[PDB]
Amino acid sequence: ADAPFEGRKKCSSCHKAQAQSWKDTAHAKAMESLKPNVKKEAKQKAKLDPAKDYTQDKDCVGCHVDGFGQKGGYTIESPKPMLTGVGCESCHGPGRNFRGDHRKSGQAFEKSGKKTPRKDLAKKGQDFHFEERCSACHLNYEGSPWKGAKAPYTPFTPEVDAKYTFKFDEMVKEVKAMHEHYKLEGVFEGEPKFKFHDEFQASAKPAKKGK
Ligand code: HEM
Numbered sequence: 001a002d003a004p005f006e007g008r009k010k011c012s013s014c015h016k017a018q019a020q021s022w023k024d025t026a027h028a029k030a031m032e033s034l035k036p037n038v039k040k041e042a043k044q045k046a047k048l049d050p051a052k053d054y055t056q057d058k059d060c061v062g063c064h065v066d067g068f069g070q071k072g073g074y075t076i077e078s079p080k081p082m083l084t085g086v087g088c089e090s091c092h093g094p095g096r097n098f099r100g101d102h103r104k105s106g107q108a109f110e111k112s113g114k115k116t117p118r119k120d121l122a123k124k125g126q127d128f129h130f131e132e133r134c135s136a137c138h139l140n141y142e143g144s145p146w147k148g149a150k151a152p153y154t155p156f157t158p159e160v161d162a163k164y165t166f167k168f169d170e171m172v173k174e175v176k177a178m179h180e181h182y183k184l185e186g187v188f189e190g191e192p193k194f195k196f197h198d199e200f201q202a203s204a205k206p207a208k209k210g211k
């Protein structure tokens with residue numbers, strides 16, 4: 001299922017709270033890391049040039065940007081800021097086809113209490129899982145548990161430093177890495193439902209910022 005990427009604009013418009021927490025995460029700042037003389041000591045350890053400008057290097061940008069190599073995604077040729085850094089769609093999926101339902105359903109639910117099955121969103125490409133997406137970026141190195149690893153490889157792996165051992169079940173649970181979770185009224189329900197969804201929502205900060 002391949003809908004085109006559009007970038008963070010509308011997601012952040014309707015989901016300000018999340019986009020507000022997100023803009024502080026490392027993912028949000030991903031392209032910064034590629035600039036010269038930035039994150040120099042970690043670059044040297046991975047044998048990368050701390051003074052080189054990697055921001056247009058095709059062996060790097062694919063993982064610090066939204067949907068590189070995909071319909072509607074980031075291109076080096078013509079950078080689009082709404083698609084730079086790993087944004088909403090890098091985890092939630094290209095949303096050209098599913099945000100449409102986020103609007104309609106929101107209104108249906110507000111007007112008459114109606115709810116929509118996640119199945120419709122998953123059919124239109126929304127991601128409720130999200131491990132394969134993270135893996136393409138984090139476990140793209142020979143010897144990792146992810147099949148289909150091919151150059152360009154993630155230069156930061158356990159061999160460089162143990163902090164880089166990626167464990168989805170632990171890492172999806174770090175709001176400083178993903179983003180803070182806020183309370184849903186539950187306009188969407190049912191399968192495919194994320195395995196930690198009820199847990200995240202059980203402890204979410206109260207909603208805020210309109211709809
Ligand atoms: C291309 C040669 C390239 C560069 C340059 C680059 C740099 C870079 C930096 C400076 C970091 C931060 C490291 C730190 O410890 O602070 C970083 C982090 C990650 N990268 Fe990267 N990166 C380049 C290329 C790639 C490619 C091709 C991928 C995906 C296959 C990729 C992925 C990642 C991931 C994942 C991280 C996070 C590591 C972690 O904290 O677990 N990078 N990159």
Ligand code: HEM
Binds near residue numbers: 011022091196
């Ligand atoms: C981009 C700025 C972005 C938006 C917008 C966004 C929104 C969003 C919402 C509304 C939820 C549900 C409610 C909540 O606050 O928990 C949600 C949930 C998850 N997100 Fe997200 N999200 C954006 C970006 C990202 C990125 C880049 C990642 C991955 C690093 C990510 C991950 C997650 C995860 C995991 C959840 C939980 C899913 C669930 O409980 O069903 N989001 N996001």
Ligand code: HEM
Binds near residue numbers: 131
């Ligand atoms: C999928 C839900 C997913 C998870 C989980 C995840 C986690 C994660 C962590 C914990 C970090 C470290 C953050 C920190 O130290 O503060 C991290 C860092 C990067 N990630 Fe990631 N990540 C997930 C998904 C993805 C995807 C799909 C990509 C590639 C488009 C990606 C890339 C990166 C990069 C790059 C970093 C480093 C940021 C920087 O300092 O440059 N992640 N991720």
Ligand code: HEM
Binds near residue numbers: 014099185186188
């Ligand atoms: C942009 C492509 C975009 C993303 C990404 C996104 C994500 C998202 C998630 C993860 C949820 C939660 C679904 C679940 O319960 O598993 C969610 C929910 C709602 N969204 Fe959204 N959303 C994106 C875009 C938009 C846009 C542009 C709007 C507004 C026109 C919008 C609206 C909503 C509404 C309403 C919900 C339901 C809230 C509730 O409390 O149940 N989204 N979105």
